Design a protein around this ligand. Structure first.
Ligand SMILES: [K+]
Ligand SMILES: [K+]
Ligand SMILES: [K+]
Ligand SMILES: [K+]
Ligand SMILES: [K+]
Lengths: 82, 82, 82, 82
């Protein structure tokens, strides 16, 4: 898969996660973006996490759609940086 | 391995983890399902975790059986989504 | 690498991590074993973590030696289970 | 890629993360180094995390640049240790 397509795919995941956390959990856009990276990179500090049923459901979807997408994106980035 | 078989395998892991956490740690079904995804995707927020010896033992088994299963499942999903 | 050798290697990492956390951080053997799995599987709930300089140094070594070892072990286990 | 080059690359990431967290979040050098490993290995205990907007932005960059770099480094280390 072309590196640029992978880039678009991860950006789409980042938008999905950021907007979802912002509207569902009520955190700021900045905190939501940060939480999205922390989540799809599977770093998960837990400083932020969903506290509502809908948030938990949403997070599971982001986990399933974002973790794999992020993994592929980073490796491809490694090539263009190495 | 057929994608559908991998799907069944991860669903089985999700059931095992959710039921185990629910009965051993006493959290709701929804919270238990959420914790199971957070755990097998190795996101681990820590908002929920085992507080009993049996829970800790159980979690280690879920980690060993679920993390690898989840990893294979996500990649296969990437193919059908990309 | 033979699956059995990989098994021995991960068991050695588990012993190293469990004994180290127990003696350095002072947690029980059970909690230490649990923390070791949570750490080498890179789940990291944070319910337990090092609170001393030596503990932090030790944890970094466990991270470097255990995460890769655990990853290889799980995949090999996937074969014998799938 | 030569193992030694990968080594230099991960060391560079470790310096970037440690210095950044120290100056941006104000934690000690030791705690910052520890947090950097915990973050790039994607262990993420959450005992330490950024509490400022700049820190969050910085952490996202470290996540993108360090997680992949660390992954490649550990595998290469596995070869020289196994
Ligand atoms: K992880
Ligand atoms: K991981
Ligand atoms: K974590
Ligand atoms: K993690
Ligand atoms: K955590």
């Amino acid at each position: 898969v072309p590196a640029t397509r992978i880039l678009l795919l991860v950006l789409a995941v980042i938008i999905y996660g950021t907007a979802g956390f912002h509207f569902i959990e009520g955190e700021s856009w900045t905190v939501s973006l940060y939480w999205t990276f922390v989540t799809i990179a599977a770093v998960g500090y837990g400083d932020y996490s969903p506290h509502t049923p809908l948030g938990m459901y949403f997070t599971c979807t982001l986990i399933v759609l974002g973790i794999g997408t992020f993994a592929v994106a980073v490796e491809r980035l490694l090539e263009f940086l190495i």
